[PDB]
Every structure is written in structure tokens, then in C-alpha cells.
Design a protein around this ligand. Structure first.
Ligand SMILES: *[C@@H]1O[C@H](CO)[C@@H](O[C@@H]2O[C@H](CO)[C@@H](O[C@H]3O[C@H](CO)[C@@H](O)[C@H](O)[C@@H]3O)[C@H](O)[C@H]2NC(C)=O)[C@H](O)[C@H]1NC(C)=O
Ligand SMILES: *[C@@H]1O[C@H](CO[C@@H]2O[C@@H](C)[C@@H](O)[C@@H](O)[C@@H]2O)[C@@H](O[C@@H]2O[C@H](CO)[C@@H](O)[C@H](O)[C@H]2NC(C)=O)[C@H](O)[C@H]1NC(C)=O
Ligand SMILES: *[C@@H]1O[C@H](CO)[C@@H](O[C@@H]2O[C@H](CO)[C@@H](O)[C@H](O)[C@H]2NC(C)=O)[C@H](O)[C@H]1NC(C)=O
Ligand SMILES: *[C@@H]1O[C@H](CO)[C@@H](O[C@@H]2O[C@H](CO)[C@@H](O)[C@H](O)[C@H]2NC(C)=O)[C@H](O)[C@H]1NC(C)=O
Ligand SMILES: *[C@@H]1O[C@H](CO)[C@@H](O[C@@H]2O[C@H](CO)[C@@H](O)[C@H](O)[C@H]2NC(C)=O)[C@H](O)[C@H]1NC(C)=O
Ligand SMILES: *[C@@H]1O[C@H](CO)[C@@H](O)[C@H](O)[C@H]1NC(C)=O
Ligand SMILES: *[C@@H]1O[C@H](CO)[C@@H](O)[C@H](O)[C@H]1NC(C)=O
Ligand SMILES: *[C@@H]1O[C@H](CO)[C@@H](O)[C@H](O)[C@H]1NC(C)=O
Ligand SMILES: *[C@@H]1O[C@H](CO)[C@@H](O)[C@H](O)[C@H]1NC(C)=O
Lengths: 194, 340, 48, 48, 182, 48
């Protein structure tokens, strides 16, 4: 079990040593917030129906009577450009605030405990998870028991020995073809039906 | 689980067929790209939401042709081979109860040009640049992922949720369930006929209910409604003057010179832009509504379909035994089974 | 020039990653004009 | 262009009142004898 | 009729395809309009019959690519358009994309999403690499070219169920997986 | 606008000038409400 575990953790190192592909979830958040700042910056290039995109090019050319007819265009243009950015940043902050509440839930239930919740701590039966940090995020190294080699068995829902029915307190009945046994639901270890 | 994907020709919505208007619309910079991208960020995450709820099994479990489930009768919720899509009898009930305005179902102009250019909202949406897009998964592929989740469940219980499927006799499996809610497994086998009769009867009540009423799927219909209502309102936003002489662009441009038209046209460029800047916001927020619903549904799949939940009232009112997923237009329907 | 060249120009990148990407919508321009109005023959009373 | 109804209004004024003929104006012409509507569709033609 | 033209009627300057309508306009009617408040039918004023107007055939364009790091070949989606029209989109009229190099065809494919060009339809189904839509996906593969295919959901598998049979694990693996949340 | 008071504008000028000023009040406010309603829609999503 330890040799599989040290090998599984080895595969995590050897895998993330080869590529950026797994970190796309952090990398995309970074990309998107950088993109929106580039978009907010690049709007200053725009005329917005004013004679120029550049404020000093209005002031260095018009009198107060005309300049206000140019400047309020700039104000209108830039104003809406901030409002859009602030809108995008609030709604994208809500996507992240959920991502944080989920991460805190995965921390509480998969780090501070062992969750019985299927697939919440990943595919397979959760044992424990180790947190690792990342730039603006968290990473979980979820350890799972996965049943891997199976054999077929014949079974009965109950047994008769003296006209009374018998049932496992824990487990299930099986036959190897020749003798009946009782065993624990998630691993083959046969025992005499006592 | 999802809502209708959309995209807008931002230039054709604001400036349809004019170079003059495009050359004004340019003076605002990236506004139309930011709008287009945002609609795309929504549309792309609908394929995510569809994927994350349904594509939880990488192996397509098929049922045995015989049905030796010990008196439990899944025939209404398993695939019916006779139908052109491999959807179940209850899914063909659910698929009739929701009205949709298109879904991407080939518009090829042999219909939507000429006569059916007039009497169809959606062809006018398509003529103002308001393109609905088909989802990545067809309803047959949703029905197959659903079939695989259901077939996996009825034949292998929770074991495919951990790894390879392990077969188990159903009656016995239900024994492990009962044992999980602490009613000791004998109490199932001592009543298996009565239990099967009730389980089948409770499926009979799901049918008799959702057949009869014309209202039941409200929580899905209101999404399909709000999508179309917002596009139909965005289409009405093209009819406004915004203080200008006319709500048709070419009836300004034929009637005015290069400067009087710049005063008029920019009114429409303003009003219309504020109509998309509204609509795209409304979608980005709704999308956050449906995202939460979809992530929650992907957890209801993980915890009520791939397993038995000890979380009280999470898998419907009662002690959970197990649940069966069903495909629906833009939705998942769980059929929860409970010990009460 | 070509569909790749529009996509580079659109993403404002000289190098394009693996994906599917949006580009400027196509629309057939009119081949030629058609004009149609009712046919009248007398001119309006401007001299009056 | 085409027109659904057409009318000509014919009258005489001093030249210093031509500025009052445009829509939504004031002055005795624009207040007491010839008012145009606020949306006036048409054209104003004057000569000495 | 059926061709794309700059129509005008009465100073109603538009652009479209004129068609014979089946609309019974009453004798006083000259125009019909869209729910959107835009004209979509009109009586011809010299020769009293009713024309439908449709704005000329058009759609979004989208491009499919494996990455510049590996190839300079791309495939192109005409979203919402049957393949025949694409020939009709010949540069003998001036399309909004001036690039028309893909109207050569030969690999032209119809999908629920539209018509796809530069990619080859392969009957074999794979994992979805680039999502085209409606169960179609595309990928660059083997002499490399872009293929398009209906996606495979996963291996088909009949489970070994019977009214009296059970599988039990004789052995296990202790897996570890990453999971990364912003 | 020359005033935030809707009737000061109506007193000081005329309808054409209102198209210049009252219009500002129309725009600016309608932006105000869209701002509040958006904040309330986002906020509502947090409370859900
Ligand atoms: C099903 O599992 C059973 C348990 O492994 C197995 O039976 C066991 O078989 C071994 C021999 O293979 C017996 O070993 C004894 O054999 C003789 C009997 O006289 C002695 O001289 C030896 O010293 C040795 O003790 C086990 O006693 C026997 N146990 C039982 C309870 O049967 C079956 O063979 C397995 N069947 C299949 C189909 O694999
Ligand atoms: C588990 O058993 C099933 C079927 O039962 C067995 O059939 C014989 C092969 C023999 O082992 C009997 O004593 C068993 O009762 C196996 O199903 C077969 O799978 C193969 C592919 O591996 C397929 O070609 C066959 O058509 C299937 N046959 C039947 C009857 O279903 C199954 O593979 C066994 N699985 C394991 C994990 O042992
Ligand atoms: C499972 O239940 C269905 C009905 O809920 C049964 O199918 C019906 O069979 C009867 C008798 O031949 C027919 O009259 C019905 O028309 C069938 N209904 C449908 C929808 O097919 C089915 O036989 C039951 N299975 C078992 C094993 O009893
Ligand atoms: C585009 O392809 C569609 C098929 O997808 C054609 O539609 C068919 O048209 C014929 C004759 O009108 C009908 O008999 C078929 O039933 C139609 N099938 C479908 C699926 O539409 C359409 O005519 C084609 N258009 C062009 C311009 O070639
Ligand atoms: C259970 O599976 C493990 C492998 O996951 C088996 O351990 C390997 O056994 C082979 C010899 O059979 C050795 O060469 C390997 O080095 C072992 N692996 C490790 C990590 O040590 C184990 O033998 C199997 N046991 C049963 C009961 O089947
Ligand atoms: C237009 O002229 C043609 C002959 O040149 C004639 O057929 C038609 O009647 C005229 N239009 C009308 C409205 O009468
Ligand atoms: C792409 O280029 C990188 C170096 O920038 C290289 O490491 C990688 O192997 C290349 N991949 C392909 C498919 O060419
Ligand atoms: C794909 O399979 C169909 C039969 O389903 C066949 O008619 C067609 O020729 C095949 N296509 C190719 C390219 O081989
Ligand atoms: C299994 O079901 C068949 C009928 O399909 C029946 O003949 C047989 O006796 C049953 N066996 C068990 C162990 O239940």
C-alpha cells in the first residue's frame, strides 16, 4: 500500500513536471483578469464620437463653449467603459466566490475529515487528501481506494442450516464453486459461515 | 442543467448592412468584441454544464436483454429500442411537456426564406444577427449518458462510481441500501414482493401525474421562456427612436447627408449598444443562476445517482435509497427512491 | 488573406493555439440594384 | 424619394422674420399667424 | 426573384431577396412588417402582386485549428447553412470575408451546425478534441490533415448481470489525483 | 443639464432646447436605475 502510494505521488510529480495542461483552471482566471485590464486600457484609444481619443488634444484646441461638447463625449465613453469592466469584475468575482466556498468545503470535508460523499473527494473511495497551495488557488492530492482486480462469484441472499434463515451481520455470502463463505462488501477475504 | 446558447452579430444588430454606421460604431473600440466574447464565455460554459452533469461515466453500460431484477420494473425508465432516439417512456413524456423556440435544428433557408421569413420570431432573430447555436451533445447523446448512468446503477449499484462496475443481484443490493439506512437487510428479503409492488406503483404515480397536467415542468420552462423573452425584447429594442427621426437605419440614410445622419445615427448606435449591454449583462447573471443549478445537479448526480446519501432531504423527502436520472430539454430530472 | 490570417488578426496574436474560434460573419452582397416606383407622367405645379 | 401627401404654404413677410419660420420658434409670426409642428417634415424656401 | 439585390420601393431603400409571397393583402395594403418593426413584404406598385422580402443569405463564420505550433492548415464552419448555398457565396458578389479559397470544396460536409469545409468526415469515432456541435467534433491527425467525426461517448460494455451473480475485488489500487480550484 | 430640476429646464428654454437638456435627465437617470438594478441583481444572486 505504501509502495503504491509513494508511486502514485511520484506520478503526480512526474506528470506536473512535464506540462502546464492541468493548471488551466488557475491560468484561465489569470488570463481573464489580465484580458479585462487590457480591454479597459485599450478603450482610451477610442474617439467615442469626439474629435480625438486624447483629452489634451481637445483642450489644446477648443474654447469652453465647444470643449464641453467634446469632453462630455469622452466622459460618456469612458464612464460606460468603467461600468462594463466593474460589471464583469463583480460577476466574475461571484464565479470565484463560489470556487472559494467550494474549496473551503473540500478543505473541511476532504482535508479535515474523511468524506463518504461519492466523487466529492474524487472518483473512488476517499481515504484522505493533502492540500497544496498555488498562485491564487488551492490544489488537493486526493487519495482513493479503487477496487482494481475482480473475480466472479456465485451468491445467495441467505443460507439454510436448520430450516432457519441466516444473513451476514456484515458482508455478503459467496461460493468459490465448491464451498460457501461470507466476506466484506468491498474486498475479497472469504471466511467460514459461522 | 443548461440554457439556450446565443451569439449576436453586434455590427449587424447596431448597424445592419451599412458601412457608414460601421465606421461610426468603430469609434467606440472593443465594445462589440467584449459583448461577443461575453456571449461566447456563456455559450462555451453551457457545453461545460452539460458535460459536468451528464458525462460522469467514461464507459457506456448496456442493460442485459432479460430483466431478472427480482420484481422491480425499470421498463418505463430504461431505453425503449422501438423509438428513433433511444430515450425511455418517461423521458418521452418529459420531452413533450416543454415548448421550445428552436434548438439549432437545421435552419437551411428552404423554410426560413420566403413565407416562413414572416410568421416566425426566430427567423427575425436570425435576420437581426441573433444566432442560437446547437449544444455539443444531441439529446440522443444525453439519453445515452443517462442510459449508461441508469443501466450502470440497476446492474452494479454504487461500484461503477468508484471504478470498474461490479455486478450484484438487485434485491440483494437494495439489502445493502436498507442496511445503509439501518433497517437490517432481512427486512427487504422478507418483503421483496411488497417493496417491488410499491416501487412499481410509485413509478406508476410519476407517470399518471406528469402525463395529466399541462404545468408540471415549470422550473425548466421558465428558463426556456426567459431566454426567448430576452431575445424577443432585444428584437423590440430595434423598433425605438431614441429621439431620432426613424427606427429604420436606411430610411435615415436615404433621407440625409453625411452630417445630419451622423447626429441621428449615433442615437441608434447609443440606444442599441445600451440594449446589447443590457441583454448580455442579463445573460451573464442568468448564466450564473443556471451554473449554480448545474453544479448542484452535478452533485445530485454524484451523490444520489452514483451513491446512497446519508444527507437528510438532499435526495428528496425521506431516507434515500437510490435515484434515477432522466434527460430533459435543458434539464436533468431525478427520480428519487426513498424508504419512508 | 485566408481563414488562419483572419483568426491571427482577430486574436491579435501571430501564433494561434488549438481550438475553435469566431470570425466576421459572412453575408452575400447584392449583385446589382432594383428600383421600383409607380409611373406618373405629369410634373407638379411648381410654376403655379 | 416619394411622398404620400404634399402641400405648399404661400405667403409674404419681411426678411427679418425668416428665422421665425423654422420649427418650435417664437416671435409674432411664429406665435400669432404661422406655427410649424415640433417634428416638421418639409423644407422652407424664401426669396426677396 | 430569388437573387440578392439593392431593392428600393418608394424610397424604402433596403437589400435582399425578393420572392412571390402567398400573402392575401387586402386592397388597401402596400406593406407588411416583421414583429421587429421592419418591412418583410411589399406590393409592387407598377404590377400589383405581393413580394416577400428576405435579407440576403448570411451567417457566422468560425475556424478550427490544431495550433500554429504544429500546422498551418485550418477547417471552417459556415454555421446555419446548407452546403449548396456556399457555392452561391461565389466572389462574383462581394462577400464580407474577401477570402474565398475554401469555396473549392471537395471535402464539403453538412452538419446540424452548418456546412464544414477543409475537414474530412471519418466514420471512426474518437474522443471530442475540438467541439463543432451536435455530436460532431474535429481533430488534426493522420500525411496529417483535419478530420471531423461524430464523437464516441466511451467504450460500449454489457455488464455481467444475472439474478444470482456477484463480482468482488481481489485487489485494489491506491490512486492519487490532483484537483485545482481558483 | 443646466438644472437637475425638470421644470427649471421647462421654464428657461423651449421644447427644442428640452431635447437638448431634459434629454440629459432622461439618459442619466435611466443609467442610474440600470446601475442600481444591476447591483441589486448581483446582490440578489449572493443572497440566493
Ligand atoms: C474453495 O476454497 C477452499 C478453501 O481454500 C478449498 O478447499 C480446501 O482445499 C485444500 C486442498 O486444496 C484442503 O487442504 C487439505 O487437504 C487434505 C484433506 O485431507 C489434507 O491432507 C491437507 O493437509 C490439507 O489440510 C483444505 O482443507 C480445503 N478446505 C475446505 C474447507 O474445503 C476448495 O478446494 C476451493 N475450491 C475451488 C473450486 O477452488
Ligand atoms: C464473469 O462471468 C461472465 C459470464 O459467466 C461466465 O461465463 C464463462 C466464460 C465461464 O467463466 C462461466 O463459468 C461463467 O459463469 C463473463 O462474461 C463473458 O465475457 C466475455 C468477454 O470477457 C464475453 O465474450 C462473453 O460473451 C461473456 N459471456 C457471458 C455468458 O456473458 C465475464 O467476462 C466474467 N468476468 C470476470 C471479471 O470474471
Ligand atoms: C413491467 O411493467 C410494464 C407496464 O408497466 C409491463 O409491460 C406491459 O405488459 C402488458 C402485458 O403484456 C401489456 O398489456 C402492456 O401494454 C405493457 N406495457 C408497456 C408500456 O409495455 C411489463 O410486462 C412489466 N414487466 C414484467 C417483467 O412484468
Ligand atoms: C439543403 O439540404 C436539405 C436537407 O438537409 C434540403 O431539404 C430537403 O429538401 C427536399 C426538397 O424540398 C425535401 O424532399 C427533403 O425532405 C428535405 N430534407 C431536409 C432534411 O431538409 C434542402 O432542400 C437543401 N437546400 C438546398 C438549397 O439545396
Ligand atoms: C495485487 O496487485 C499488486 C500490484 O498492484 C501486486 O503487487 C505486485 O506483484 C508483482 C508480482 O506478482 C510484483 O512484481 C510487483 O513488484 C508488485 N507491485 C508492487 C507495487 O510491489 C500484488 O501481488 C497483487 N496481489 C494479489 C493478492 O493479487
Ligand atoms: C405603368 O406603366 C405600364 C405601361 O408602361 C402600365 O402597364 C401600368 O398600368 C402603369 N402603372 C399603373 C399603376 O397603372
Ligand atoms: C510545441 O513547441 C514546444 C516548444 O515551444 C515543444 O516543447 C513541444 O514539443 C511542441 N509540440 C508540438 C506538438 O510541436
Ligand atoms: C461510412 O459508413 C457508411 C455506412 O454506414 C458507408 O456508406 C460510407 O461509405 C462510409 N464512409 C466512408 C468514407 O467509407
Ligand atoms: C433466475 O431466474 C430464472 C428465470 O429467468 C429462474 O428460472 C431461476 O430459477 C432463477 N435463479 C435464481 C438463483 O434465482
Amino acid at each position: 500500500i505504501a509502495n503504491q502510494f509513494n508511486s502514485a505521488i511520484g506520478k503526480i510529480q512526474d506528470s506536473l513536471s512535464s506540462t502546464a495542461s492541468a493548471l488551466g483552471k488557475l491560468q484561465d482566471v489569470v488570463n481573464q483578469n489580465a484580458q479585462a485590464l487590457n480591454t479597459l486600457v485599450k478603450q482610451l484609444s477610442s474617439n467615442f464620437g469626439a474629435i480625438s481619443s486624447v483629452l489634451n488634444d481637445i483642450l489644446s484646441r477648443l474654447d469652453k463653449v465647444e470643449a464641453e461638447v467634446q469632453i462630455d463625449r469622452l466622459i460618456t465613453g469612458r464612464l460606460q467603459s468603467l461600468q462594463t469592466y466593474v460589471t464583469q469584475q463583480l460577476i466574475r468575482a461571484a464565479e470565484i466566490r463560489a470556487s472559494a466556498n467550494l474549496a473551503a468545503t473540500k478543505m473541511s470535508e476532504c482535508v479535515l475529515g474523511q468524506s463518504k460523499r461519492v466523487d466529492f473527494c474524487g472518483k473512488g473511495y476517499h481515504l484522505m487528501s493533502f492540500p497544496q497551495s498555488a498562485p491564487h488557488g488551492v490544489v488537493f492530492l486526493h487519495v482513493t481506494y479503487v477496487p482494481a482486480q475482480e473475480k466472479n462469484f456465485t451468491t445467495a441472499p441467505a443460507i439454510c442450516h436448520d430450516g432457519k434463515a441466516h444473513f451476514p451481520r456484515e458482508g455478503v455470502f459467496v461460493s468459490n464453486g465448491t464451498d460457501w463463505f461470507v466476506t466484506q462488501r468491498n474486498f475479497y477475504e472469504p471466511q467460514i459461515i459461522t | 442543467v443548461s440554457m439556450t446558447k446565443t451569439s449576436v452579430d453586434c455590427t449587424m444588430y447596431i448597424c445592419g448592412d451599412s458601412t457608414e454606421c460601421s465606421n461610426l460604431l468603430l469609434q467606440y473600440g472593443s465594445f462589440c468584441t467584449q459583448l461577443n466574447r461575453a456571449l461566447t464565455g456563456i455559450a462555451v460554459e453551457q457545453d461545460k454544464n452539460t458535460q459536468e452533469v451528464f458525462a460522469q461515466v467514461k464507459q457506456i453500460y448496456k442493460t442485459p436483454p432479460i430483466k431478472d431484477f427480482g420484481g422491480f420494473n425499470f421498463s418505463q425508465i430504461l431505453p425503449d429500442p422501438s423509438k428513433p432516439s433511444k430515450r425511455s417512456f418517461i423521458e418521452d413524456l418529459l420531452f413533450n411537456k416543454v415548448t421550445l423556440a428552436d434548438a439549432g435544428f437545421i435552419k437551411q433557408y428552404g423554410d426560413c426564406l420566403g413565407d416562413i421569413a414572416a410568421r416566425d420570431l426566430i427567423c427575425a432573430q436570425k435576420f437581426n444577427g441573433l444566432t442560437v447555436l446547437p449544444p455539443l451533445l444531441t439529446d440522443e447523446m444525453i439519453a445515452q449518458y443517462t442510459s449508461a448512468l441508469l443501466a450502470g446503477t440497476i446492474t452494479s449499484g454504487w461500484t461503477f462510481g468508484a471504478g470498474a462496475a461490479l455486478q450484484i443481484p438487485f434485491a440483494m443490493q437494495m439489502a445493502y441500501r436498507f442496511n445503509g439506512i439501518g433497517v437490517t437487510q432481512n427486512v427487504l428479503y422478507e418483503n421483496q414482493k411488497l417493496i417491488a409492488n410499491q416501487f412499481n406503483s410509485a413509478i406508476g404515480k410519476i407517470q399518471d401525474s406528469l402525463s395529466s397536467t399541462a404545468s408540471a415542468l415549470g422550473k425548466l420552462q421558465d428558463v426556456v421562456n426567459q431566454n426567448a423573452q430576452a431575445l424577443n425584447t432585444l428584437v423590440k429594442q430595434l423598433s425605438s427612436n431614441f429621439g431620432a427621426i426613424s427606427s429604420v437605419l436606411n430610411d435615415i440614410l436615404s433621407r440625409l447627408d453625411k452630417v445630419e445622419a451622423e447626429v441621428q445615427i449615433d442615437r441608434l448606435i447609443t440606444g442599441r449598444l445600451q440594449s446589447l449591454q443590457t441583454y448580455v449583462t442579463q445573460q451573464l447573471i442568468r448564466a450564473a443562476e443556471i451554473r449554480a443549478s448545474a453544479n448542484l445537479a452535478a452533485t445530485k448526480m454524484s451523490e444520489c445517482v452514483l451513491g446512497q446519501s446519508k444527507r437528510v432531504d438532499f435526495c428528496g423527502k425521506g431516507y434515500h435509497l437510490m435515484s434515477f436520472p432522466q434527460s430533459a430539454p435543458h434539464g436533468v430530472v431525478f427520480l428519487h427512491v426513498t424508504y419512508v | 488573406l485566408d481563414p488562419l490570417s483572419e483568426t491571427k488578426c482577430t486574436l491579435k496574436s501571430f501564433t494561434v493555439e488549438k481550438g475553435i474560434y469566431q470570425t466576421s460573419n459572412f453575408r452575400v452582397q447584392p449583385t446589382e440594384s432594383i428600383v421600383r416606383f409607380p409611373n406618373i407622367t405629369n410634373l407638379c405645379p411648381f410654376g403655379e | 424619394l416619394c411622398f404620400t401627401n404634399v402641400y405648399a404654404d404661400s405667403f409674404v413677410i419681411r426678411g427679418d422674420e425668416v428665422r421665425q419660420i423654422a420649427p418650435g420658434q417664437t416671435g409674432k409670426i411664429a406665435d400669432y399667424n404661422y406655427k410649424l409642428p415640433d417634428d416638421f417634415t418639409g423644407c422652407v424656401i424664401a426669396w426677396n | 426573384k430569388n437573387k440578392c439585390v439593392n431593392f428600393n420601393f418608394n424610397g424604402l431603400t433596403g437589400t435582399g431577396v425578393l420572392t412571390e409571397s402567398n400573402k392575401k393583402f387586402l386592397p388597401f395594403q402596400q406593406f407588411g412588417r416583421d414583429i421587429a418593426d421592419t418591412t418583410d413584404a411589399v406590393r409592387d406598385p407598377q404590377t400589383l402582386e405581393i413580394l416577400d422580402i428576405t435579407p440576403c443569405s448570411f451567417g457566422g463564420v468560425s475556424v478550427i485549428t490544431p495550433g500554429t505550433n504544429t500546422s498551418n492548415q485550418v477547417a471552417v464552419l459556415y454555421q446555419g447553412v446548407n452546403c449548396t448555398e456556399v457555392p452561391v457565396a461565389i466572389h462574383a458578389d462581394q462577400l464580407t470575408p474577401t477570402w474565398r479559397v475554401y469555396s473549392t470544396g471537395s471535402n464539403v460536409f453538412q452538419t446540424r451546425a452548418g456546412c464544414l469545409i477543409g475537414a474530412e468526415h471519418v466514420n471512426n469515432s474518437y474522443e471530442c478534441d475540438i467541439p463543432i456541435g451536435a455530436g460532431i467534433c474535429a481533430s488534426y491527425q493522420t500525411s496529417q490533415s483535419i478530420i471531423a467525426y461524430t464523437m464516441s461517448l466511451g467504450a460500449e460494455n454489457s455488464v455481467a448481470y444475472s439474478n444470482n451473480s456477484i463480482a468482488i475485488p481481489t485487489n485494489f489500487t491506491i490512486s492519487v489525483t490532483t484537483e485545482i480550484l481558483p
